[PDB]
Design a protein around this ligand. Structure first.
Ligand SMILES: O=C1CCCC/C=C/CCOC(=O)c2c(O)cc(O)c(Cl)c2C1
Ligand SMILES: O=C1CCCC/C=C/CCOC(=O)c2c(O)cc(O)c(Cl)c2C1
Lengths: 212, 212
């Protein structure tokens, strides 16, 4: 059974602006999600300094990108700190409020959409290329949970009995818009990664399917 | 909650012989599993001739091989007919009895282990390289289930609330022996596939992880 929650209204507004914008450089979403992945990895590593056992649920520290062409899905995974049910609700449904409000004001004055992660709300840039997202997350402190949004005013959180087990960390599962399926292609994915992420401390793994 | 079942004793015997054998050409397991995958795909396609809706749960017809190095796991997937809970029990725990008995007699006389799929029991050759297997299966007729064996006399079947959803078909998840980790490597995997499977009607997809 799902539970339904309301977004802070300013987040809803930002999602509306992003999902509908004709902004041309949609590729910036990948930089923002890799940056969030890298931050979540920094947290578990720093946390582990005083609690090394925290690492044991998933000792490999990575960012992993997995196109799933038949489902028109792109997944961005990290083995970072992960989020509890309460953290998914709070991180994704609430605390972005102040950053989103400041960002929308900047946008009104003519700020580039690419400034979004300087306002600390780069997560929502996924709506440039996707019309739906599932955030699947496993924290050492909770069960695995699925947070789901379609850019509307409400989101769901559901105990996860349907997805692969993450040892620890987070998968952003992006349901790509029909005109943004280039983000399923290995050459395109590599090209975007290479541009705006050379100083990532973690391996960035691309999962490719090849016919033998 | 798992349920526990007993193997037909001759299957238990065959698993013991295979898991312990010093037979040198262990690579033959992959041919046997690809052959079973191809057969299961033939069944859903033939079934669909009169019931085209059967295909809709997973329209792409494929065999897919996925090394998971950190877990020391190799997965072999097909989108074939799949198995219900009752079929997993019967196909894997029971009906192999007659083939296994005939095969063990052949082996006593000096038959090559590679003859195993001519006795219709090639599935058990996975124990050349693995000491544990989960068969994760989704039939159009049932929920997703996990059948699990460690070559002992009993197996478990558990309703699946932990793995990715298969639309339809079967994953063999092989937990590789510590000396058989070469089967995690892309070059090795491709080399074995190419030898003893050129007349497979279905794409054979290798899922490789590459650092960008
Ligand atoms: O708030 C988040 C990111 C904010 C920056 C740093 C905080 C990290 C710890 C929890 O965040 C996460 O697990 C996490 C992630 O792994 C990937 C993501 O794309 C997102 Cl959006 C999040 C949630
Ligand atoms: O008995 C099986 C194979 C016997 C040959 C043909 C019967 C196919 C229909 C059901 O089998 C399956 O789904 C199936 C599969 O997809 C892959 C496998 O490795 C195995 Cl072992 C099986 C189970």
């Amino acid at each position: 059974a799902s539970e339904t929650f309301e977004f802070q209204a300013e987040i809803t507004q930002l999602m509306s602006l992003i999902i509908n914008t004709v902004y041309s450089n949609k590729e910036i979403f990948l930089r923002e999600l890799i940056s969030n992945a890298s931050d979540a990895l920094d947290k578990i590593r720093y946390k582990s300094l005083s609690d090394p056992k925290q690492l044991e649920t998933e000792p490999d520290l990575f960012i992993r990108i997995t196109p799933k062409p038949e489902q028109k899905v792109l997944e961005i995974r990290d083995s970072g700190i992960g989020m509890t049910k309460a953290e998914l609700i709070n991180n994704l449904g609430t605390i972005a409020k102040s950053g989103t409000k400041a960002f929308m004001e900047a946008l009104s004055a003519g700020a580039d959409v690419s400034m979004i992660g300087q306002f600390g709300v780069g997560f929502y840039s996924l709506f440039l290329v996707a019309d739906r997202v599932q955030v699947i997350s496993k924290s050492n402190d909770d069960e695995q949970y699925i947070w789901e949004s379609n850019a509307g005013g409400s989101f769901t959180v559901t105990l996860d009995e349907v997805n692969e087990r993450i040892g620890r960390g987070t998968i952003l599962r992006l349901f790509l818009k029909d005109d943004q399926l280039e983000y399923l292609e290995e050459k395109r994915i590599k090209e975007v990664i290479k541009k705006h992420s050379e100083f990532v401390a973690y391996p960035i793994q691309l999962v490719v399917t090849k016919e033998v």
